[PDB]
Amino acid sequence: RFLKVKNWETDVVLTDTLHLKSTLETGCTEHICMGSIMLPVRTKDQLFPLAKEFLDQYYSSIKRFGSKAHMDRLEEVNKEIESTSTYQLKDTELIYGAKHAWRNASRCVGRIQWSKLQVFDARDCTTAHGMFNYICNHVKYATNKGNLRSAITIFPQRTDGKHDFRVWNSQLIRYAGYKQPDGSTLGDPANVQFTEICIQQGWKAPRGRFDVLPLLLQANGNDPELFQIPPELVLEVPIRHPKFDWFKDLGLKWYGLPAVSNMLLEIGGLEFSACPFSGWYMGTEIGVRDYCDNSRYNILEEVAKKMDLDMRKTSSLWKDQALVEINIAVLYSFQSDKVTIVDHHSATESFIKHMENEYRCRGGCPADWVWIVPPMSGSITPVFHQEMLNYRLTPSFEYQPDPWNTHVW
Amino acid sequence: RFLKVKNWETDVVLTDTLHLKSTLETGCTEHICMGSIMLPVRTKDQLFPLAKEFLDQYYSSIKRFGSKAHMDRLEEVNKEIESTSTYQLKDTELIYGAKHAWRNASRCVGRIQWSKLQVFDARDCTTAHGMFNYICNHVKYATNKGNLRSAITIFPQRTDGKHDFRVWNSQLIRYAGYKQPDGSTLGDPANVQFTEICIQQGWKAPRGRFDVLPLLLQANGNDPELFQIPPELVLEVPIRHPKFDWFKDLGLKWYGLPAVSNMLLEIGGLEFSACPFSGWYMGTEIGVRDYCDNSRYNILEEVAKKMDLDMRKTSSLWKDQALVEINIAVLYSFQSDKVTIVDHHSATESFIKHMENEYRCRGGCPADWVWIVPPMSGSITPVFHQEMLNYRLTPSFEYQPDPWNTHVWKG
Ligand code: HEM
Ligand code: HEM
Ligand SMILES: CNCC#Cc1cc(F)cc(CCc2cc(C)cc(N)n2)c1
Ligand SMILES: CNCC#Cc1cc(F)cc(CCc2cc(C)cc(N)n2)c1
Ligand SMILES: C[C@H](O)[C@H](O)[C@H]1CNc2nc(N)[nH]c(=O)c2N1
Ligand SMILES: C[C@H](O)[C@H](O)[C@H]1CNc2nc(N)[nH]c(=O)c2N1
Ligand SMILES: [Zn+2]
């Protein structure tokens, strides 16, 4: 019950005790492992133990467990729940909860940065225009002229489920997708449904292959509203190769800021349904997944052709060769334009160091191998040879239904 | 109960019912997933239900469930267990068993081939010399001059655990590794400890970078004995690159036959502790893992040097670049010498078709994503996008401890 993890490249063995503090379910049982499954209104009852657990770890973290300030705060929240059917976090607790939600994100390879997160308190927001303002300020702060900085903006918490704040976009910045009469796909096929709901809601699209989508913002349970992000706030990078001068004519570009906006943040039982956060890209997210997934921009074939590779037989590894060159260019382009990016070798080495830090100072680090190992060159990165234990700690980020499936219109 | 898996590239959804016939445990709980963890003496008591379940499975597959043949066999096995505390499998049951152990191996991406396994019955073997002979015949058969054929050889089952048959080699064909006084390694670093044992047992080592190890064979719980596989039986492939002529000068080669010899075969509660099996290679096993793991031959740097890549910054992806060229060379060399090999694109595509077939005809296909996805170019293969369920079915292949850690020496 005190578990060991081994690195098979280095024989380093770590002992995990942090998992004993876990609480939520994994999806797995002793008869079946669901490790590769993508996705496996609270009453007054459920709330106070949740608050208590959180406050206990918060006051522990500032070395005031069993202090009178601790007992008093527990007292105050207890009477506030008994009274108001909910409670409000102090600023200090909010910042702690958000930083620890990132710390606990088992699928995130970038967590060595977890304690340097800028938290923007937007709990005073009441309207979609106000949400837009907070989001523009977030985007500008985080982008920082290419020197990216981690940030999260937190909108008001769920009350009765009918007054929910939601960002309808999956990320703050993404490209539109249109299914053409031809039958093909112009732009990002992953965003076809959402692009429809923008047009079917009022948007007028340029119908190009890299059009930045508008924000669709929902405040207090109302109908969502369209806003265009000021183009000067959206930092983009043209993609060039340091060797193939024909690479330009492909016409590729990508945005600098990865900013997830559809997740749910849980802290001490409270639910924050609108909590966009951003960091900086790992190169493979763009070059491997965005550009070379068959259900995305799927450019492999075209690039292979311009390299004049033998595409007759799969065993010539022409896909593999092109894949590497595409990813060299993404990194090269960002680097040249001085926009923060990390390669998968550096990021995974960072994560190993973070793991050893967490095992030493916290007794563990929940981690999902299936998501942590990069989508190219897996076994030449150190995380491939690293055993990992996956379990759920709170505060946490969780998935939630798409709004258009839920919103009573 | 029912369970659904989804392919996120194609949106194909499958329904698993086979998991209901799962018995052994996974290591996971509702509170922790052990999915990336590498690793997890039997009485009359537990044995007859294990036998009964196996015989029910067998007679079902041959459309004879509940027949008098079925009932007589159950009664016969029952009496034999109560009388002798164990029992013997018929040839037909053994063949069925070995095939289904492969069919059930959730870490194996090559299972589309499972029904075409050649099973060699070596249960009459009594000495290490006899084991050597059976193993030579297996290697000749399986190699087939480069037209590889899947096979398995099955030695006598465990009795009291004091009389085990064991092949001490992890694979039948492997290169020696030697630790030098300056701390460097000559040959395959993975095999240093085993090489040391062989030498201690009296092997005269050539001490080169690709020396084929001797077989170390244990019969009936006796001390293991050393044997050299006849060189004319060990097919090897010199590694060259189709565009880079300097690649041959690196002096690389590899053997053609992947043959695992340290696993345990469990069938109807019986335990076969020596059961070498062989197939053919997927290119990445050699090109990515054997050559490029830091803890193996580790040739990324010399290859990258000769390609004159920018090796200063890792963001040049000089490692990824060299890795691809090496895997091109491995496939090119095998194909050119007409030795059976499959690339990771072909193999994963075949596995997806296998898996879908198994869902329709069998109700499921247990699979371990962590092992099925290839160690390079993961997401451009179709298995990356495929949800999989992992559970344990019997008959099965299992890990067992290394024999040098458990053996009682006679002297
Ligand atoms: C600063 C640099 C960061 C890097 C390089 C990074 C990297 C990544 C990557 C590569 C993934 C895999 C996701 C995918 O493949 O789609 C991921 C997942 C995730 N990241 Fe990070 N991240 C960073 C910052 C952050 C921040 C600031 C937060 C929150 C405050 C965060 C929270 C998460 C969460 C919750 C997931 C998994 C969500 C899911 O299950 O889909 N990350 N990250
Ligand atoms: C015919 C071609 C075959 C191919 C291409 C193939 C491929 C593979 C690969 C790539 C692995 C992962 C191994 C590693 O990364 O070290 C594996 C594992 C495995 N294979 Fe297959 N295999 C084949 C035939 C067979 C046969 C004939 C058997 C048994 C009768 C078998 C049983 C297994 C088992 C039990 C594992 C589990 C490995 C472990 O847990 O250590 N395979 N196979
Ligand atoms: C069906 N599942 C869809 C999804 C998803 C997703 C969720 C996440 F939380 C982060 C990312 C990757 C985006 C990202 C975000 C940040 C903050 C940094 C980074 N490098 N990448 C993807
Ligand atoms: C501690 N672990 C020891 C081990 C092991 C092992 C077991 C296996 F079942 C297969 C392979 C991979 C070798 C292999 C075997 C076969 C039959 C085919 C193939 N392509 N590769 C390794
Ligand atoms: C089915 C499988 O779980 C799915 O394809 C996962 C695999 N690993 C992943 N890993 C990351 N980082 N991101 C992903 O989207 C996925 N997809
Ligand atoms: C820690 C992790 O389980 C380990 O490195 C695994 C990952 N996946 C693998 N997959 C295959 N096919 N072979 C392996 O040896 C491994 N090693
Ligand atoms: Zn699991």
The per-residue DSSP string of B250-272 comes to G--EEES--EE-S-EEEETTEEE
Assess whether A111 carries a catalytic annotation. yes
| Inter-CA distances, A385 with A378, B253, B297, B371, Å | 9, 25, 16, 12
How many residues are there in chain A? Answer: 409
**Ion ligand 7 contact residues with beta carbon within 5 A:** A 28, 33, 35; B 28, 33, 35
Confirm whether A365 is a catalytic residue. no
What's the A377 CA to ligand 5 centre distance in angstroms? 15
| Interchain contact, A380 vs B292, CB within 8 Å | yes
**CA triple B180-B183-B186, angle to 5 deg:** 45
Q: What residues 347-376 of chain A have any CB closer than 8 A to a CB of chain B?
A: 368-370, 373-376
**Quick check: do B16-123+150-160+264-278+348-372 and B236-258+281-346 share a fold?**
no
The resolution, in angstroms to one decimal, equals 1.8
Instruction: Please choose, from the candidates A150, A96, A68, the residue with its C-alpha nearest in 3D space to the C-alpha of residue A268.
Output: A96
* Number of CB atoms found within 10 A of residue A403's CB: 18
Residue whose CA lies nearest to ligand 6 atom number 3: B36
CATH topology of domain A124-149+164-235+399-403: Nitric Oxide Synthase;Heme Domain; Chain A, domain 2 (3.90.440)
Could you give the residue ranges of the DSSP H alpha helices within A296-392? 300-306, 318-336, 344-361, 369-372
How many other C-beta atoms are found inside a 10 Å radius of the C-beta of residue A229?
Answer: 17
Residue whose CA is closest, atom 13 of ligand 5? Answer: A371
Q: Any idea which architecture A16-123+150-160+264-278+348-372 has in CATH? A: Alpha-Beta Complex (3.90)
CB count within 10 Å of CB B253 equals 14
Which chain A residues have a beta carbon less than 8 Å from that of B373?
378
Name the token pair of B383.
């298995």
Distance A260 CA to ligand 3 centre (A): 6
Give the start-end residues of each E strand in B128-249: 151-154, 166-167, 177-179, 185-187, 215-218, 225-227, 236-238
**Catalytic entry in A108, A125, A198, A365:** A108
Q: How many distinct helices (H) and strands (E) make up chain A?
A: 11, 18
DSSP H or E segment with residue A92:
helix A91-103
- Beta partners for B226? B216
Domain assignments of chain B as residue spans, ordered by start: 16-123+150-160+264-278+348-372, 124-149+164-235+399-403, 236-258+281-346
Q: Which helix (H) or strand (E) holds B193?
A: helix B192-200
**Residue B323 sits at the chain A interface (C-beta within 8 Å):** yes
Task: Kindly state the helix (H) or strand (E) to which residue A48 belongs, with its residue range.
Answer: helix A44-61
Reply yes or no on domain B236-258+281-346 having CATH 3.90.1230.10.
yes
Instruction: Choose among B378, B100, B159: nearest CA to A380.
Output: B378
Query: Among all residues of chain A, which has the CA nearest to that of B344?
Result: A315
CA nearest neighbour of A168 among A119, A210, A218, A208 = A218
The rounded distance, in Å, linking the Cα atoms of A252 and A332 is 13
The minimum-distance atom of ligand 4 relative to the CA of B282 is 20
The Cα B125–Cα B165 span in angstroms is 10
Shortest CA distance to A381 belongs to which of A6, A9, A2, A3? A9
